[PDB]
Amino acid sequence: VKVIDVGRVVVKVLGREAGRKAVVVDIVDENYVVITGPKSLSGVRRRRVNINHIEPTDKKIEIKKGASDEEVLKALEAAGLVEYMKERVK
Amino acid sequence: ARPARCYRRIKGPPYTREEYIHGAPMIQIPKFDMGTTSAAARAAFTMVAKLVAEERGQIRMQALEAARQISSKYLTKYVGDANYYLRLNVVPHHVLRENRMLAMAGADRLQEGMRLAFGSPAGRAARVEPGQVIFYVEFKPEHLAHVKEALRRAASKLPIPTRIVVEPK
Amino acid sequence: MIVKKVLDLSQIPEKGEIVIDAEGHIMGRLASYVAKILLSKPELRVVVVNAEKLVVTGDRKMVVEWFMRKISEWRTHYNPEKAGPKIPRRPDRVFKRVVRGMLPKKVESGRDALKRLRVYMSIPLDFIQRRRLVLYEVPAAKLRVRPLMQFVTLEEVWRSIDPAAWEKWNKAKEVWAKKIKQA
Amino acid sequence: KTVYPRYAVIRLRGIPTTPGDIAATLDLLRLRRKFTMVVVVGSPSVMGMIERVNDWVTWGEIDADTLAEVLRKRGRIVGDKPLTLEYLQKWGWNSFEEVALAYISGEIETLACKKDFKAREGQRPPCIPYLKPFFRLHPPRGGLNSVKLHFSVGGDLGYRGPLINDLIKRML
RNA sequence: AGGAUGCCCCCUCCCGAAGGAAACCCCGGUGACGGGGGAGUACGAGGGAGGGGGUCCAGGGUCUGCCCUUACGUCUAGAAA
RNA sequence: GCGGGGGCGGUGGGGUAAGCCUCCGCUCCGAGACGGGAACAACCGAGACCGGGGUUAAGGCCCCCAAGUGCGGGCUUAGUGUCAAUCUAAAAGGGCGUCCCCCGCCCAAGACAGCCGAGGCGGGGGGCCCCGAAGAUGUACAGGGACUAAGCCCGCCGCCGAGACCCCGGCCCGCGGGCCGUUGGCCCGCGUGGGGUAGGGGGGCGCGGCCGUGGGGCAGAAGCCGGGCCGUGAGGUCCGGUGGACCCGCGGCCGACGAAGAUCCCGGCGG
Ligand SMILES: [Mg+2]
Ligand SMILES: [Mg+2]
Ligand SMILES: [Mg+2]
Ligand SMILES: [Mg+2]
Ligand SMILES: [Mg+2]
Ligand SMILES: [Mg+2]
Ligand SMILES: [Mg+2]
Ligand SMILES: [Mg+2]
Ligand SMILES: [Mg+2]
Ligand SMILES: [Mg+2]
Ligand SMILES: [Mg+2]
Ligand SMILES: [Mg+2]
Ligand SMILES: [Mg+2]
Ligand SMILES: [Mg+2]
Ligand SMILES: [Mg+2]
Ligand SMILES: [Mg+2]
Ligand SMILES: [Mg+2]
Ligand SMILES: [Mg+2]
Ligand SMILES: [Mg+2]
Ligand SMILES: [Mg+2]
């Protein structure tokens, strides 16, 4: 079973941003969430995403729902995951 | 008689000119308006129910008569004749033909098969269109359930699908 | 030791042999993948192990009635050994027949592709006693388990349609379980 | 006086089974083979013919750049030779872009000179003399949607608007 | 009686119709994918030149693999019937 | 030739209906190759001189089988179903089975079940599925494997895929022009030129002989067996073996002039 929650770090597995990491910032419905794997950090534009097109990682930051890119960077500095975020899987 | 599926479908022009049709059958339906037919007493009735055709086809005179008896008997038994007006809105103008070897019906009916295949008269039917109003009931609003049941029983005797439409007068 | 891996469909070797663990996989989808692999690699051999743990989706009663009808109503009135059908019941033979249905018919290519396949129930002692047994999974042919979903195993089908042979095989498994766990 | 819109019409369906009236109209419109293209002036008689053959062709308003590119790639002269820019300058046209602009803007009323046209000396003719009045396109790159459905329902047939230029580029 | 000034392999060079990519960078879409550059590029039927290596090549008999394929003559709307 | 046929449309007219009878119009088969449709003359695509390259049409892309176990949402639990027709199906009627849309009423927390505290009742309709649904050689038939999506609905993206369309090379044709002493030959130009039964038109190959002309043959003619080369082809020519005296090229002319078939005739010979 796949679990997606706000603040979870995921990896996009479909699209041009495949293999790049992002952070779940908001939930649209049971099928879509909002991810901003910041464009200034990983190259993932802040957009909606289907649940089928992202795989969750094992690291999570604490943020409010729909948190801005500034808050996402602040939490990334808090968790020390900038270097993890910049990596590209496969 | 043949099954009604033999004459359900409209397959040719209407056959109604009785001055040209030889031995055209009589219309056996004895009456078409049921209940309180006078408009002065129909002024009391405010609800209109309509049994309405859903497909295009032909209804036989016997089928129309059977639906008429079942609906009229139910309405008399459970609403009383002073509380409803029921009209069979269609008349079986169309004359049905059957091609069959038979008794004294012309010398061309003694040749077998499809030779001289124009049939003799076999009955009457009403050609109906979709949305055509087959049965029209005027009633007081308290008898809505009984009127719907009578229309359902009438619809059970007809060869085409129908529906019940209720509205105010 | 058994090392599990994911079969890269574009990275299939052109030579040698590959072993596929069939547990958790759907029978028709895995058979489709195996048939395409055998057709696309003419010199590769394919072994399938754990054939009794294959899954068929649907109601158990529906699948069992389908297999019963196949093994009972399908026959011939001519010489049965010369002309009639011969319906398999054991899970390995059932899976091999399913792959034969997806291979080309009445052709040397289909015959050779079917001959280049071996199917086993469980894992044989010879395979276990190897130094390094590389097993594969095909993720596209694996059943995604969901609540309130209906499916049966080929072992359950075999038990329903042939209880005595299943009992003998299960007893053999229990008899050799100590040596199997040793290896 | 009036400058009607200049349309590109491409025959999308085939020569066998097509009904007789449509076939006759297509033959009169010069779309006698599949994937033949013509450029016409949108007078009412021509629009009546196009409405008659709506279910066998696709048509639209062609632009000057697409017309120039069509003349460069698929233009043919008498004897089936390719149309050349030096041929244009010999006849008095400076470039494919200039002649296409003149035709589309309505400075001239025809692209190809008629069979009865006579060429004088010095004057620039108002057409391209001895040019064939039709183009034979390549099949479209990436395919079409459906040659049996209208463009207005997701198919390919009928009025296409300015998307005929995109189709022509895919078909060049 | 045919070619052996052949045939085949490899390499290299030149030209080349219609057609025509890829990594990678940039813009967009949930996405399968589209677009700008890469690039009318690498390539591409075929047409020329040369280098080395080998012996037969064409053609024929039979067999195998893959692809294709419903005896003939006749009346007939309609023939494997 | 005066036997037509298929699809679609005139509720064509008739008929219970019919792969039924009889009219009207377009198209296709007959007389039309080829791709798809599981096979299949006329359903869809499409019109084929030969060879090669490319791109598309119908339709398809889990395997059989080239191309996607492609993408988003929703429905189905019946293996229902599995992308038009030929082609193998299904009705009235019943079902809150399930998903959903709308309307009337009650509940102002004193509403529906018998003090409790939050929704309840009734009606109409739509989608899928279930019952209605019973056959004869052999499996949930309608291609098979099988699939819980590889089913259905609303949308979407790319790709595969003909002889069609584009390109190259070769061939031939129609028409026009030109040159050569010509019952004819050659060259050039143009053609949204290149299917074809009956039938009409044009040219050529072969067999026996005759009028001419030029030759071969005992150092081996005709015939026969196998083989190479030429020609789209009818056919021609040459090589090796056998054989033992006639034969052939070219122009012209003439016929007892070309066989695969007639329950063909004669002979020989098989299983
Ligand atoms: Mg009729
Ligand atoms: Mg038994
Ligand atoms: Mg045996
Ligand atoms: Mg057609
Ligand atoms: Mg030689
Ligand atoms: Mg006959
Ligand atoms: Mg007959
Ligand atoms: Mg005939
Ligand atoms: Mg025949
Ligand atoms: Mg006649
Ligand atoms: Mg007809
Ligand atoms: Mg087919
Ligand atoms: Mg494939
Ligand atoms: Mg019916
Ligand atoms: Mg079924
Ligand atoms: Mg021809
Ligand atoms: Mg002579
Ligand atoms: Mg003959
Ligand atoms: Mg004899
Ligand atoms: Mg004998």
PDB file of N, CA, C and O (backbone and C1' of nucleotides) in Angstrom, chain F residues 225-247:
ATOM      1  P     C F 225      13.321 -35.620 -75.585  1.00  0.00           P
ATOM      2  O5'   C F 225      14.568 -35.908 -74.643  1.00  0.00           O
ATOM      3  C5'   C F 225      14.649 -37.101 -73.881  1.00  0.00           C
ATOM      4  C4'   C F 225      15.924 -37.154 -73.080  1.00  0.00           C
ATOM      5  C3'   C F 225      16.286 -35.890 -72.320  1.00  0.00           C
ATOM      6  O3'   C F 225      15.584 -35.754 -71.100  1.00  0.00           O
ATOM      7  C1'   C F 225      18.181 -36.672 -73.473  1.00  0.00           C
ATOM      8  P     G F 226      15.101 -34.307 -70.605  1.00  0.00           P
ATOM      9  O5'   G F 226      16.423 -33.620 -70.044  1.00  0.00           O
ATOM     10  C5'   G F 226      16.940 -33.974 -68.771  1.00  0.00           C
ATOM     11  C4'   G F 226      18.391 -33.591 -68.626  1.00  0.00           C
ATOM     12  C3'   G F 226      18.692 -32.108 -68.517  1.00  0.00           C
ATOM     13  O3'   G F 226      18.446 -31.584 -67.225  1.00  0.00           O
ATOM     14  C1'   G F 226      20.200 -33.102 -70.030  1.00  0.00           C
ATOM     15  P     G F 227      17.988 -30.056 -67.044  1.00  0.00           P
ATOM     16  O5'   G F 227      19.247 -29.207 -67.525  1.00  0.00           O
ATOM     17  C5'   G F 227      20.408 -29.111 -66.718  1.00  0.00           C
ATOM     18  C4'   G F 227      21.552 -28.437 -67.438  1.00  0.00           C
ATOM     19  C3'   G F 227      21.400 -26.957 -67.739  1.00  0.00           C
ATOM     20  O3'   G F 227      21.643 -26.134 -66.616  1.00  0.00           O
ATOM     21  C1'   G F 227      22.276 -28.065 -69.628  1.00  0.00           C
ATOM     22  P     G F 228      20.976 -24.678 -66.526  1.00  0.00           P
ATOM     23  O5'   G F 228      21.892 -23.769 -67.456  1.00  0.00           O
ATOM     24  C5'   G F 228      23.211 -23.436 -67.065  1.00  0.00           C
ATOM     25  C4'   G F 228      23.929 -22.643 -68.127  1.00  0.00           C
ATOM     26  C3'   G F 228      23.297 -21.325 -68.531  1.00  0.00           C
ATOM     27  O3'   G F 228      23.559 -20.286 -67.610  1.00  0.00           O
ATOM     28  C1'   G F 228      23.981 -22.501 -70.459  1.00  0.00           C
ATOM     29  P     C F 229      22.561 -19.036 -67.492  1.00  0.00           P
ATOM     30  O5'   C F 229      22.627 -18.348 -68.923  1.00  0.00           O
ATOM     31  C5'   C F 229      23.733 -17.540 -69.290  1.00  0.00           C
ATOM     32  C4'   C F 229      23.604 -17.031 -70.701  1.00  0.00           C
ATOM     33  C3'   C F 229      22.384 -16.177 -70.999  1.00  0.00           C
ATOM     34  O3'   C F 229      22.527 -14.836 -70.573  1.00  0.00           O
ATOM     35  C1'   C F 229      22.627 -17.793 -72.689  1.00  0.00           C
ATOM     36  P     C F 230      21.231 -13.940 -70.271  1.00  0.00           P
ATOM     37  O5'   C F 230      20.572 -13.721 -71.699  1.00  0.00           O
ATOM     38  C5'   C F 230      21.202 -12.905 -72.673  1.00  0.00           C
ATOM     39  C4'   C F 230      20.402 -12.854 -73.946  1.00  0.00           C
ATOM     40  C3'   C F 230      18.973 -12.357 -73.816  1.00  0.00           C
ATOM     41  O3'   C F 230      18.886 -10.947 -73.784  1.00  0.00           O
ATOM     42  C1'   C F 230      19.009 -14.322 -75.122  1.00  0.00           C
ATOM     43  P     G F 231      17.931 -10.218 -72.723  1.00  0.00           P
ATOM     44  O5'   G F 231      16.473 -10.405 -73.329  1.00  0.00           O
ATOM     45  C5'   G F 231      16.145  -9.869 -74.600  1.00  0.00           C
ATOM     46  C4'   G F 231      14.849 -10.423 -75.137  1.00  0.00           C
ATOM     47  C3'   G F 231      13.666 -10.464 -74.186  1.00  0.00           C
ATOM     48  O3'   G F 231      13.060  -9.204 -73.968  1.00  0.00           O
ATOM     49  C1'   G F 231      13.780 -12.488 -75.387  1.00  0.00           C
ATOM     50  P     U F 232      12.831  -8.672 -72.471  1.00  0.00           P
ATOM     51  O5'   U F 232      11.662  -9.589 -71.896  1.00  0.00           O
ATOM     52  C5'   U F 232      11.475  -9.740 -70.496  1.00  0.00           C
ATOM     53  C4'   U F 232      10.044 -10.068 -70.146  1.00  0.00           C
ATOM     54  C3'   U F 232       9.455 -11.314 -70.786  1.00  0.00           C
ATOM     55  O3'   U F 232       9.796 -12.493 -70.079  1.00  0.00           O
ATOM     56  C1'   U F 232       7.906  -9.518 -70.905  1.00  0.00           C
ATOM     57  P     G F 233      10.391 -13.766 -70.845  1.00  0.00           P
ATOM     58  O5'   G F 233       9.185 -14.293 -71.738  1.00  0.00           O
ATOM     59  C5'   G F 233       8.003 -14.819 -71.154  1.00  0.00           C
ATOM     60  C4'   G F 233       6.900 -14.909 -72.174  1.00  0.00           C
ATOM     61  C3'   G F 233       7.198 -15.788 -73.378  1.00  0.00           C
ATOM     62  O3'   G F 233       6.847 -17.137 -73.132  1.00  0.00           O
ATOM     63  C1'   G F 233       6.377 -13.680 -74.098  1.00  0.00           C
ATOM     64  P     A F 234       7.631 -18.339 -73.842  1.00  0.00           P
ATOM     65  O5'   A F 234       6.838 -18.567 -75.200  1.00  0.00           O
ATOM     66  C5'   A F 234       5.467 -18.935 -75.198  1.00  0.00           C
ATOM     67  C4'   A F 234       4.825 -18.627 -76.524  1.00  0.00           C
ATOM     68  C3'   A F 234       5.529 -19.195 -77.745  1.00  0.00           C
ATOM     69  O3'   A F 234       5.158 -20.534 -78.015  1.00  0.00           O
ATOM     70  C1'   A F 234       5.060 -16.907 -78.096  1.00  0.00           C
ATOM     71  P     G F 235       6.135 -21.748 -77.640  1.00  0.00           P
ATOM     72  O5'   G F 235       7.546 -21.329 -78.246  1.00  0.00           O
ATOM     73  C5'   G F 235       7.756 -21.280 -79.648  1.00  0.00           C
ATOM     74  C4'   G F 235       8.703 -20.172 -80.037  1.00  0.00           C
ATOM     75  C3'   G F 235      10.146 -20.561 -80.289  1.00  0.00           C
ATOM     76  O3'   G F 235      10.360 -21.167 -81.548  1.00  0.00           O
ATOM     77  C1'   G F 235      10.102 -18.648 -78.946  1.00  0.00           C
ATOM     78  P     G F 236      11.656 -22.082 -81.785  1.00  0.00           P
ATOM     79  O5'   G F 236      12.874 -21.064 -81.707  1.00  0.00           O
ATOM     80  C5'   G F 236      13.001 -20.004 -82.641  1.00  0.00           C
ATOM     81  C4'   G F 236      14.199 -19.137 -82.345  1.00  0.00           C
ATOM     82  C3'   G F 236      15.549 -19.832 -82.349  1.00  0.00           C
ATOM     83  O3'   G F 236      16.067 -19.999 -83.654  1.00  0.00           O
ATOM     84  C1'   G F 236      15.378 -18.461 -80.440  1.00  0.00           C
ATOM     85  P     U F 237      16.951 -21.284 -84.016  1.00  0.00           P
ATOM     86  O5'   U F 237      18.309 -21.067 -83.214  1.00  0.00           O
ATOM     87  C5'   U F 237      19.149 -19.956 -83.487  1.00  0.00           C
ATOM     88  C4'   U F 237      20.164 -19.736 -82.392  1.00  0.00           C
ATOM     89  C3'   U F 237      21.071 -20.907 -82.061  1.00  0.00           C
ATOM     90  O3'   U F 237      22.140 -21.057 -82.973  1.00  0.00           O
ATOM     91  C1'   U F 237      20.250 -19.973 -80.066  1.00  0.00           C
ATOM     92  P     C F 238      22.722 -22.513 -83.304  1.00  0.00           P
ATOM     93  O5'   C F 238      23.732 -22.821 -82.114  1.00  0.00           O
ATOM     94  C5'   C F 238      24.909 -22.053 -81.926  1.00  0.00           C
ATOM     95  C4'   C F 238      25.388 -22.112 -80.496  1.00  0.00           C
ATOM     96  C3'   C F 238      25.851 -23.467 -79.987  1.00  0.00           C
ATOM     97  O3'   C F 238      27.163 -23.802 -80.394  1.00  0.00           O
ATOM     98  C1'   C F 238      24.433 -22.478 -78.390  1.00  0.00           C
ATOM     99  P     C F 239      27.629 -25.336 -80.450  1.00  0.00           P
ATOM    100  O5'   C F 239      27.724 -25.775 -78.925  1.00  0.00           O
ATOM    101  C5'   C F 239      28.803 -25.350 -78.109  1.00  0.00           C
ATOM    102  C4'   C F 239      28.783 -26.032 -76.765  1.00  0.00           C
ATOM    103  C3'   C F 239      28.838 -27.551 -76.791  1.00  0.00           C
ATOM    104  O3'   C F 239      30.153 -28.048 -76.945  1.00  0.00           O
ATOM    105  C1'   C F 239      27.134 -26.844 -75.315  1.00  0.00           C
ATOM    106  P     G F 240      30.421 -29.405 -77.759  1.00  0.00           P
ATOM    107  O5'   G F 240      29.972 -30.552 -76.755  1.00  0.00           O
ATOM    108  C5'   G F 240      30.679 -30.779 -75.548  1.00  0.00           C
ATOM    109  C4'   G F 240      29.970 -31.775 -74.670  1.00  0.00           C
ATOM    110  C3'   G F 240      29.502 -33.055 -75.344  1.00  0.00           C
ATOM    111  O3'   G F 240      30.534 -34.008 -75.508  1.00  0.00           O
ATOM    112  C1'   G F 240      27.761 -32.188 -74.020  1.00  0.00           C
ATOM    113  P     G F 241      30.431 -35.131 -76.650  1.00  0.00           P
ATOM    114  O5'   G F 241      29.179 -36.017 -76.224  1.00  0.00           O
ATOM    115  C5'   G F 241      29.317 -37.052 -75.264  1.00  0.00           C
ATOM    116  C4'   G F 241      28.007 -37.751 -74.997  1.00  0.00           C
ATOM    117  C3'   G F 241      27.434 -38.576 -76.137  1.00  0.00           C
ATOM    118  O3'   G F 241      28.035 -39.853 -76.261  1.00  0.00           O
ATOM    119  C1'   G F 241      25.729 -37.250 -75.187  1.00  0.00           C
ATOM    120  P     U F 242      28.109 -40.581 -77.692  1.00  0.00           P
ATOM    121  O5'   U F 242      26.589 -40.870 -78.066  1.00  0.00           O
ATOM    122  C5'   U F 242      25.833 -41.865 -77.389  1.00  0.00           C
ATOM    123  C4'   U F 242      24.425 -41.916 -77.922  1.00  0.00           C
ATOM    124  C3'   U F 242      24.299 -42.170 -79.415  1.00  0.00           C
ATOM    125  O3'   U F 242      24.339 -43.544 -79.747  1.00  0.00           O
ATOM    126  C1'   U F 242      22.978 -40.313 -78.829  1.00  0.00           C
ATOM    127  P     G F 243      24.844 -43.997 -81.196  1.00  0.00           P
ATOM    128  O5'   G F 243      23.854 -43.268 -82.203  1.00  0.00           O
ATOM    129  C5'   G F 243      22.475 -43.600 -82.270  1.00  0.00           C
ATOM    130  C4'   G F 243      21.785 -42.779 -83.326  1.00  0.00           C
ATOM    131  C3'   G F 243      22.392 -42.890 -84.715  1.00  0.00           C
ATOM    132  O3'   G F 243      21.803 -43.951 -85.442  1.00  0.00           O
ATOM    133  C1'   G F 243      22.117 -40.601 -84.124  1.00  0.00           C
ATOM    134  P     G F 244      22.693 -44.961 -86.306  1.00  0.00           P
ATOM    135  O5'   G F 244      22.471 -44.467 -87.801  1.00  0.00           O
ATOM    136  C5'   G F 244      21.192 -44.022 -88.237  1.00  0.00           C
ATOM    137  C4'   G F 244      21.300 -42.774 -89.072  1.00  0.00           C
ATOM    138  C3'   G F 244      21.896 -42.974 -90.461  1.00  0.00           C
ATOM    139  O3'   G F 244      21.340 -42.010 -91.356  1.00  0.00           O
ATOM    140  C1'   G F 244      23.287 -41.537 -89.214  1.00  0.00           C
ATOM    141  P     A F 245      21.291 -42.294 -92.937  1.00  0.00           P
ATOM    142  O5'   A F 245      20.917 -40.886 -93.572  1.00  0.00           O
ATOM    143  C5'   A F 245      19.577 -40.543 -93.906  1.00  0.00           C
ATOM    144  C4'   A F 245      19.525 -39.190 -94.563  1.00  0.00           C
ATOM    145  C3'   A F 245      20.152 -39.130 -95.951  1.00  0.00           C
ATOM    146  O3'   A F 245      19.589 -38.047 -96.688  1.00  0.00           O
ATOM    147  C1'   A F 245      21.404 -37.800 -94.475  1.00  0.00           C
ATOM    148  P     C F 246      18.153 -38.156 -97.391  1.00  0.00           P
ATOM    149  O5'   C F 246      17.550 -36.695 -97.200  1.00  0.00           O
ATOM    150  C5'   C F 246      16.793 -36.374 -96.046  1.00  0.00           C
ATOM    151  C4'   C F 246      17.563 -35.532 -95.055  1.00  0.00           C
ATOM    152  C3'   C F 246      17.151 -34.081 -94.927  1.00  0.00           C
ATOM    153  O3'   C F 246      15.924 -33.892 -94.254  1.00  0.00           O
ATOM    154  C1'   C F 246      19.495 -34.222 -94.904  1.00  0.00           C
ATOM    155  P     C F 247      14.983 -32.658 -94.656  1.00  0.00           P
ATOM    156  O5'   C F 247      15.673 -31.408 -93.960  1.00  0.00           O
ATOM    157  C5'   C F 247      16.079 -31.475 -92.607  1.00  0.00           C
ATOM    158  C4'   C F 247      16.975 -30.323 -92.234  1.00  0.00           C
ATOM    159  C3'   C F 247      16.453 -28.931 -92.532  1.00  0.00           C
ATOM    160  O3'   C F 247      15.499 -28.484 -91.587  1.00  0.00           O
ATOM    161  C1'   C F 247      18.722 -29.085 -93.162  1.00  0.00           C
TER     162        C F 247
END
